[PDB]
RNA sequence: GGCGCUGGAGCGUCGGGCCCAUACCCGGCCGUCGCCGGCAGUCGAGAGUGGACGGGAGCGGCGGCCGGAGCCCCGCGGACGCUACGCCGCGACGAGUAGGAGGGCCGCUGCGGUGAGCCUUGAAGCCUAGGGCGCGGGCCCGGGUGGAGCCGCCGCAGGUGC
């Protein structure tokens, strides 16, 4: 379960890092990169992830599908978009508030997604 | 969930299934209990030990 | 200066299981939701009984 | 709809009018006036043109961010009161009134002697010490920074002009457009230059200031000379 | 043009006998020496003039060696005249018996 | 349902208006009732003065029943029975004040720590001043100030105490539930006394400012809140 | 021309000194670390007036601004370019120090990744 | 206490002012204690001090005296949060030897794990008018020297702090 697997972690994992009296967790599919319960992106049924594409273009978005929780090669569906800013972040929208699938990671991806498009946009002079 | 036990696939040697299932095991729906693994770990870990003096 | 006497400030209580069973801590946090959000006393000692310790929890006999 | 009429409770002190409630509702005649019972389109259909596009567009106005910064700032709470600058009321030493020769303490005009003329919109002094006296024209000044004297000439029934507001008396400046890396120096246009119309505002107030300040004895000496503490005395003993 | 401040003294800081309180100073008013005469320079501002080997930026001027501890009036200090002083900073202690000069700027008359 | 509940709710609203109309209304007039009852008093005391001086007799008021009661000393080197008795009036720091009903046995106990109270007979203004500018609630064993009327009604309605008049009223003319109005109200923090004090370490009748001083305490209060 | 901080607040600091040892002008072999006196007689101990302060939890700095350096950001160690993206959504309130000990080729590296992420590096320029 | 003081800077009786303690009052910040306080409602539709139905017979405002079902959508949108060992609120309080207890993201050495950790493009150690953080124990970073190893986190164990 969900809590249980946090009561084991919360304090015990390999992703967590406690530095100048700050901590943070770097599993794969966690908004915000920080040690909470709701931002874990291991111990939940369903989880969401924003990632930068594989080359520098475009975003990941990562979600976990219901069936196969123990099946860690096929439990991740991850699509690629490569729009503009607006419609990037009008997909993840619909993506995680259509679908209901973890409407309390909505704001924490559309930032990780606007983070990730802003840093691939080349630098100024 | 602990009365529940699903079908584990046998996987061959060239990496995919093969057709085979065993059910879970019910010593994997046990008490997951992290300070009981902890204490048995540290007192079993000092007897290995070899004496110094 | 304010004439008071400090040696009982701190009540000596249990606000938290000693343990570190981490179900018994599940279950914990689920009836401190519960008492903290029904007007049930029964929650309230039942919690407080769950931070007991063994010996403030002695076993009960079938008979 | 009907015309908006005037308060009909007298205010005595602030906050506490002159008449009860009850008195009010007489006055008000609420016993006849008894009720009892009886937008902004965001998106705009547009022509988008070109065959086979469909037949319109519904456009909206006022898209969503394309970007969010990854952390924002909470909204404050409410103050019910700390109003803007511009709605202050302005309050003024009654020691200070139109004609008043007035000391000017700070500033290049330091110790001088000025005429008083009108306080502004934001409560700055507008002042004319007669630019032929001691080259004072019409210049703002702060109440705080000048001292009152006794001495007033009746400057009442002459004409400042309407135009001679804080826009009027407001500095202008010039940098730095189309210039954001300084290698060549822009020190140019530092030079003031005195409007024609201000020259013109000014003859025409010293115009009908003059001869009224001309009408008591040397006054103009007075508005000549500059304040200045003398080692004997002290400015707690001075009546000014 | 002419001296335009009112000539006082730092005669000292706010003290008991065996403790001071640096923050704020004990300023003697030239010509004020009873308690109802300072009524007039309550709330004043006043400054500590003085000149140091480094120039510094002038407001309004080139730099020259004058630098400024400004400060204000508080209020009135016993019976004889003193005033109480708050600057920015503490005055220095090597301007006891020195010179501070009262600006008349915040007028009320 | 939308209309319904819209309905329902409207209603809730203006019935929690009226009602909050209605308990202010009442206030109002039971705040002119006391002024009535305060002004009558004082004109009374006048009257009966007079009459009985224009019959050539004399006209005894009242013992007064009030009293406020300061805290002048400090808490080091105190005995134990007028360190106990301290306590037992809630005046556990200096320049503490407090309201006490006088009866034999409050007159006692105040005449035991004498050297370190001052009191007196407090007057309408006084009580008005320090309920007002000093009043602290007692709710939930927490000091909270008297910001508004709710506070005291939620801990007083019971007793017919619903507003500061109503607080006011209790404690000036000591009424049925003065015990429980006075426990509720915070023992009043009050600064030191401006102008300075006489001799703390005296008798008021000798020069000093311990014991009581009869009405010479609302010029004690006046500097000292 | 560098990264602001969400916020900035005035940063108040109770005690800008340093807290030092008693005695530890007297002796070299005294460090000037904090240690609690304990002497019987030790008037440092018994706070007598005109001696050396004694450390308390009265000097806390507040907690909205404890720990902030001058710029208003707050310091993460990291050593390598990894430990750099856990700050990408802490940007606006977390700096980044690059590790002492690593290399002038590595801290390139996590300088130009930071530079493309926007977080500041208080020490950007540290082997070159 | 000294200088000194004799229409007092002496003695007795008194007045008005004024001076300042870490005391009292107001405010800010820190911590402790208490409310065994609040938050699983992330519930932008949740709406709650009763709601449902279900037929009786009736009013009250609109639909010429017979008359009624409403569902979000011109916008598909709506900050942060909740390491629950977390976060938030309110109130009171703060001396301390001998002594007791708690916390320590204080520090030292070694072991099991972990950091796809650091490092000859320079480890440890040392030096430094260099920049800072913490109430503090202490720590991080810059520069130099040096030339081969070293550290963080979760546990474990001491020949562990002058
Ligand atoms: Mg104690
Ligand atoms: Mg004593
Ligand atoms: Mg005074
Ligand atoms: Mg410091
Ligand atoms: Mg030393
Ligand atoms: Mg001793
Ligand atoms: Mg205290
Ligand atoms: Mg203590
Ligand atoms: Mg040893």
Redesign the interface.
């Given at each position: 379960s969900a809590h249980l697997q946090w009561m084991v972690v919360r304090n015990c994992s390999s992703f967590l890092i406690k530095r100048n009296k700050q901590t943070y967790s770097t599993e794969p599919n966690n908004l915000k990169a920080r040690n909470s319960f709701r931002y874990n992106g291991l111990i939940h049924r369903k989880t969401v992830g924003v990632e930068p594409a594989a080359d520098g273009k475009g975003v990941v978005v990562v979600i976990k599908r219901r069936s196969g929780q123990r099946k860690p090669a096929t439990s991740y569906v991850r699509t690629t978009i490569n729009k503009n800013a607006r419609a990037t972040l009008s997909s993840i929208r619909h993506m995680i508030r259509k679908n209901k699938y973890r409407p309390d990671l909505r704001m924490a991806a559309i930032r990780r997604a606007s983070a990730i498009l802003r840093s691939q946009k080349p630098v100024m002079v | 969930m602990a009365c529940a036990r699903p079908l584990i696939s046998v996987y061959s040697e060239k990496g995919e299934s093969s057709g085979k299932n065993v059910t879970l095991p019910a010593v994997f729906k046990a008490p997951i209990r992290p300070d009981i693994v902890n204490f048995v770990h540290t007192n079993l870990r000092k007897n290995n030990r070899q004496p110094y003096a | 200066?304010?004439?008071?006497r400090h040696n009982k400030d701190r009540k000596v209580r249990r606000k938290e299981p000693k343990?570190?069973?981490?179900?018994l801590?599940?279950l914990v946090?689920l009836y401190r939701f519960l008492a903290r959000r029904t007007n049930s006393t029964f929650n309230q000692v039942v919690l407080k009984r769950l931070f007991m310790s063994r010996t403030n929890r002695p076993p009960l006999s079938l008979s | 709809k009907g015309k908006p009429h005037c308060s009909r409770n007298p205010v005595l002190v602030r906050g506490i009018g002159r008449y009860s409630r009850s008195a009010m509702y007489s006055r008000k005649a609420m016993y006849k006036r008894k009720y009892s019972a009886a937008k902004v389109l965001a998106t705009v259909t547009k022509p988008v043109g070109g065959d086979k596009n469909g037949g319109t567009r519904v456009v909206k106005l006022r898209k969503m961010p394309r970007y969010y910064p990854t952390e924002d700032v909470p909204r404050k709470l409410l103050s019910h009161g700390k109003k803007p600058f511009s709605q202050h009321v302005r309050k003024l030493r009654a020691s200070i009134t139109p004609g008043t020769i007035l000391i000017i303490l700070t500033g290049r005009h330091r110790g001088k002697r000025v005429v008083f003329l009108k306080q502004l919109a934001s409560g700055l002094l507008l002042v004319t010490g007669p630019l032929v006296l001691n080259r004072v024209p019409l210049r703002r000044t702060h109440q705080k920074f000048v001292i009152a004297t006794s001495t007033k000439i009746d400057i009442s029934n002459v004409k400042i002009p309407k135009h001679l507001t804080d826009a009027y008396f407001k500095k202008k400046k010039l940098r730095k457009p189309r210039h954001q890396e300084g290698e060549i120096f822009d020190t140019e246009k530092e030079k003031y230059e005195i409007t024609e119309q201000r020259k013109i505002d000014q003859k025409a107030v010293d115009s009908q200031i003059l001869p009224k300040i001309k009408a008591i004895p040397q006054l103009q000496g007075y508005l000549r000379s500059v304040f200045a503490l003398t080692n004997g005395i002290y400015p707690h003993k001075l009546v000014f | 043009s002419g001296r335009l401040w009112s000539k006082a003294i730092f005669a000292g800081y706010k003290r008991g006998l065996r403790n001071q309180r640096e923050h704020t100073a004990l300023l003697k008013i030239e010509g004020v020496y009873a308690r109802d005469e300072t009524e007039f320079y309550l709330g004043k501002r006043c400054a500590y003039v003085y000149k140091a080997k480094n120039n510094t930026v002038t407001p309004g001027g080139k730099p020259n060696k004058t630098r400024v501890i400004w400060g204000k009036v508080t209020r009135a200090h016993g019976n004889s005249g003193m005033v109480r002083a708050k600057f920015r900073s503490n005055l220095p202690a090597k301007a006891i018996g020195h010179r501070i000069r009262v600006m008349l700027y915040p007028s009320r008359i | 349902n939308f209309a319904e509940l819209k309905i329902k709710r409207l209603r809730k609203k203006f019935a929690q208006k009226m009602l909050r109309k209605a308990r202010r209304k009442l206030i109002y007039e039971k705040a002119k009732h006391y002024h009535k009852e305060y002004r009558q008093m004082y004109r009374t005391e006048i009257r009966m003065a007079r009459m009985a001086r224009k019959a050539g007799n004399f006209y005894v008021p009242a013992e007064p029943k009030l009293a406020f009661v300061i805290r002048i000393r400090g808490i080091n080197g105190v005995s134990p029975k007028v360190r106990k008795v301290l306590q037992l009036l809630r005046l556990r720091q200096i320049f503490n004040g407090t309201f006490v009903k006088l009866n034999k046995a409050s007159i006692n106990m105040l005449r035991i720590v004498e050297p370190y109270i001052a009191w007196g007979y407090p007057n309408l203004k006084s009580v008005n001043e320090l309920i007002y500018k000093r009043g602290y609630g007692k709710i939930n064993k927490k000091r909270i100030a008297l910001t508004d009327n709710a506070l005291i009604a939620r801990s007083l309605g019971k007793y017919g105490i619903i507003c500061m008049e109503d607080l006011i009223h209790e404690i000036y003319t000591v009424g049925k539930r003065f015990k429980e109005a006075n426990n509720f109200l915070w023992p009043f923090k009050l600064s030191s006394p401006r102008g300075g004090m006489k001799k703390k370490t005296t008798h008021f009748v000798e020069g000093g400012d311990a014991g009581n001083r009869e009405d010479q305490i609302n010029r004690l209060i006046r500097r000292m809140n | 021309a560098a990264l602001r901080p969400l916020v900035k607040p005035k940063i108040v600091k109770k005690r800008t000194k340093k807290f030092i040892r008693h005695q530890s002008d007297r002796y070299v072999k005294i460090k000037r670390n904090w240690r609690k006196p304990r002497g019987i007689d030790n008037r440092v101990r018994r706070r007598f007036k005109g001696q050396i302060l004694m450390p308390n939890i009265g000097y806390g700095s507040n907690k909205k601004t404890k720990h902030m350096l001058p710029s208003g950001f707050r310091k993460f160690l990291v050593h390598n370019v990894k430990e750099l993206e856990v700050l990408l959504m802490c940007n606006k309130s977390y700096c980044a120090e690059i590790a002492h000990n690593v290399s002038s080729k590595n801290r390139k590296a996590i300088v130009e990744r930071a530079a493309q992420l926007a977080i500041r590096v208080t020490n950007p320029n540290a082997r070159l």
């Amino acid at each position: 379960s969900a809590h249980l697997q946090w009561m084991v972690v919360r304090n015990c994992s390999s992703f967590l890092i406690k530095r100048n009296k700050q901590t943070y967790s770097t599993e794969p599919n966690n908004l915000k990169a920080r040690n909470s319960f709701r931002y874990n992106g291991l111990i939940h049924r369903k989880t969401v992830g924003v990632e930068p594409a594989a080359d520098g273009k475009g975003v990941v978005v990562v979600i976990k599908r219901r069936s196969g929780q123990r099946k860690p090669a096929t439990s991740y569906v991850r699509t690629t978009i490569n729009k503009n800013a607006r419609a990037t972040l009008s997909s993840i929208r619909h993506m995680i508030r259509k679908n209901k699938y973890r409407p309390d990671l909505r704001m924490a991806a559309i930032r990780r997604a606007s983070a990730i498009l802003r840093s691939q946009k080349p630098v100024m002079v | 969930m602990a009365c529940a036990r699903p079908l584990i696939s046998v996987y061959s040697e060239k990496g995919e299934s093969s057709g085979k299932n065993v059910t879970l095991p019910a010593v994997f729906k046990a008490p997951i209990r992290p300070d009981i693994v902890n204490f048995v770990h540290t007192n079993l870990r000092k007897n290995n030990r070899q004496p110094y003096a | 200066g304010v004439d008071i006497r400090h040696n009982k400030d701190r009540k000596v209580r249990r606000k938290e299981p000693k343990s570190q069973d981490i179900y018994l801590r599940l279950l914990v946090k689920l009836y401190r939701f519960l008492a903290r959000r029904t007007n049930s006393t029964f929650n309230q000692v039942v919690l407080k009984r769950l931070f007991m310790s063994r010996t403030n929890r002695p076993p009960l006999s079938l008979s | 709809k009907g015309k908006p009429h005037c308060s009909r409770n007298p205010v005595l002190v602030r906050g506490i009018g002159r008449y009860s409630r009850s008195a009010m509702y007489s006055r008000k005649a609420m016993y006849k006036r008894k009720y009892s019972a009886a937008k902004v389109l965001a998106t705009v259909t547009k022509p988008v043109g070109g065959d086979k596009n469909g037949g319109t567009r519904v456009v909206k106005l006022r898209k969503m961010p394309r970007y969010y910064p990854t952390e924002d700032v909470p909204r404050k709470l409410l103050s019910h009161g700390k109003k803007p600058f511009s709605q202050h009321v302005r309050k003024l030493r009654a020691s200070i009134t139109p004609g008043t020769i007035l000391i000017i303490l700070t500033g290049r005009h330091r110790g001088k002697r000025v005429v008083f003329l009108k306080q502004l919109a934001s409560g700055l002094l507008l002042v004319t010490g007669p630019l032929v006296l001691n080259r004072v024209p019409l210049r703002r000044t702060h109440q705080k920074f000048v001292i009152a004297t006794s001495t007033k000439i009746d400057i009442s029934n002459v004409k400042i002009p309407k135009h001679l507001t804080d826009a009027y008396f407001k500095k202008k400046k010039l940098r730095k457009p189309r210039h954001q890396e300084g290698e060549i120096f822009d020190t140019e246009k530092e030079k003031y230059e005195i409007t024609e119309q201000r020259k013109i505002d000014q003859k025409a107030v010293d115009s009908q200031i003059l001869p009224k300040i001309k009408a008591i004895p040397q006054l103009q000496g007075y508005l000549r000379s500059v304040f200045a503490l003398t080692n004997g005395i002290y400015p707690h003993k001075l009546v000014f | 043009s002419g001296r335009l401040w009112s000539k006082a003294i730092f005669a000292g800081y706010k003290r008991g006998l065996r403790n001071q309180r640096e923050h704020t100073a004990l300023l003697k008013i030239e010509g004020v020496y009873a308690r109802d005469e300072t009524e007039f320079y309550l709330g004043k501002r006043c400054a500590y003039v003085y000149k140091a080997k480094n120039n510094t930026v002038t407001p309004g001027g080139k730099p020259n060696k004058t630098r400024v501890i400004w400060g204000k009036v508080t209020r009135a200090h016993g019976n004889s005249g003193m005033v109480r002083a708050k600057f920015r900073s503490n005055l220095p202690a090597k301007a006891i018996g020195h010179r501070i000069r009262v600006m008349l700027y915040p007028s009320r008359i | 349902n939308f209309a319904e509940l819209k309905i329902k709710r409207l209603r809730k609203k203006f019935a929690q208006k009226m009602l909050r109309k209605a308990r202010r209304k009442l206030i109002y007039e039971k705040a002119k009732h006391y002024h009535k009852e305060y002004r009558q008093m004082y004109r009374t005391e006048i009257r009966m003065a007079r009459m009985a001086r224009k019959a050539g007799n004399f006209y005894v008021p009242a013992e007064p029943k009030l009293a406020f009661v300061i805290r002048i000393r400090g808490i080091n080197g105190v005995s134990p029975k007028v360190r106990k008795v301290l306590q037992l009036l809630r005046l556990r720091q200096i320049f503490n004040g407090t309201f006490v009903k006088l009866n034999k046995a409050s007159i006692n106990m105040l005449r035991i720590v004498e050297p370190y109270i001052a009191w007196g007979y407090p007057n309408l203004k006084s009580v008005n001043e320090l309920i007002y500018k000093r009043g602290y609630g007692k709710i939930n064993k927490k000091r909270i100030a008297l910001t508004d009327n709710a506070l005291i009604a939620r801990s007083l309605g019971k007793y017919g105490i619903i507003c500061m008049e109503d607080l006011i009223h209790e404690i000036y003319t000591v009424g049925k539930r003065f015990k429980e109005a006075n426990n509720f109200l915070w023992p009043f923090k009050l600064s030191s006394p401006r102008g300075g004090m006489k001799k703390k370490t005296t008798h008021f009748v000798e020069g000093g400012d311990a014991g009581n001083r009869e009405d010479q305490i609302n010029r004690l209060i006046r500097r000292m809140n | 021309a560098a990264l602001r901080p969400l916020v900035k607040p005035k940063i108040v600091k109770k005690r800008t000194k340093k807290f030092i040892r008693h005695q530890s002008d007297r002796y070299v072999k005294i460090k000037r670390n904090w240690r609690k006196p304990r002497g019987i007689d030790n008037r440092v101990r018994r706070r007598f007036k005109g001696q050396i302060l004694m450390p308390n939890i009265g000097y806390g700095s507040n907690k909205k601004t404890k720990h902030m350096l001058p710029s208003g950001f707050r310091k993460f160690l990291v050593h390598n370019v990894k430990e750099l993206e856990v700050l990408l959504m802490c940007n606006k309130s977390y700096c980044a120090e690059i590790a002492h000990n690593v290399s002038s080729k590595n801290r390139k590296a996590i300088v130009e990744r930071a530079a493309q992420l926007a977080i500041r590096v208080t020490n950007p320029n540290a082997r070159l």
